[model samples]
Target: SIKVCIADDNRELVSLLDEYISSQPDMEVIGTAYNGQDCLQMLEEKRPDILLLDIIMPHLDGLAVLERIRAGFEHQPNVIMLTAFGQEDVTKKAVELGASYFILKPFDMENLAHHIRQVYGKTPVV
Candidate 1:
């Protein structure tokens, strides 16, 4: 199964991601974090296959977190930028930092899954 870490500052969105990730038979929720720093801390201790990261978060932003992961982490997870509409610049930066994909808010979870699978180069472990 593809283990996933959902990192977002919005509690409601985080909860939604939890439910969505759980509902996916080939994916498992390894953990969730509310801030970029906490997400980074978790990654340092336990790495997942996918990191669903929101752009705006506390302690550090997603771009900054992505930079650290790309530069310092030994086992860098596949990052998927969780962006809102009009966040193209942030998405581009995340991609530059090696994010696998980007998903806008208010999007279909199935589409996000499709992107994840595409990145993984096969049916998602979920």
Candidate 2:
């Protein structure tokens, strides 16, 4: 099974992702975090295969978290930035920080699922 960690301060969003991941037969929610620091801690412990992360957070932001993960983890989990604000600047910065992909807010969860599957398949973007 593909293990995933959902990190977002929004309780409702996190819960929604939890529900969606649970519904997938080949994927599972291994952990959840509300902040970047908490996510880093969880990463050390859970070592999930994928991380669905929010950009803004307490202590450490998603971009900072991505940089730290790159420096520390021998096999860093794929980072997928999920943000409510999808500014061009944020998109550029996120890509520079090595996020595997991004999902804008109010996005279709079905489409989100497809993106996650694409990450798992290691598919190149066209």
Candidate 3:
């Protein structure tokens, strides 16, 4: 199974995704964090295969967390930044900061799960 974690402040969106993503057969949502600080904690504690992190989180911000993770923090996971529309500047920085990918906001829930599966990258055997 692919372990996935979420970090975004939108409560309704998080709840919706939590239910949607967890329902996928090959995926598991280990936890959800609403702030950038907790995002780091989720990364370390849950050790998810992929982290769906939001770029504009309060307290620490996602970019800062990226720096912290790159600063030799153990338990690094493939990161998929959750970016809103018109956030291209920060999104560019996020890509340069080594995020595995980015998902634009107001996305289809099914597509979100598909991206998670794609990023996890373990194709089924024939």
The whole-model lDDT of each prediction reads: 0.84, 0.89, 0.82
Q: Which tens-of-lDDT digit does each residue in 77-110 have in candidate 2?
A: 8888988978999899888888999999878888
Off by over 4 Å in 1: 122-126
Q: Write the per-residue lDDT of candidate 1 for residues 34-90, one digit (tens) a residue.
A: 999999888987779888888788799888889999889789788888878436576
Please write out the lDDT profile of model 3 over residues 1-126, one tens digit for every residue.
988888898898889888988888988899999998888887777888888888777898888887787775767778888768437687788878878888887688888888887888842476
Better of 2 and 3 by lDDT: 2
* Candidate with maximal lDDT: 2
- Rank the candidate models, highest lDDT first: 2, 1, 3
Candidate 2 lDDT: 0.89
lDDT of 2 at 61: 86
Worst 10 residues of 3 by lDDT: 117-126
Among residues 3 or more apart in sequence or in different chains, the pairs in candidate 1 whose N, CA or C atoms overlap within 3 Å are 26-125, 26-126, 27-126
Taking all chains together, each candidate's TM-score versus the true structure is 0.89, 0.93, 0.88
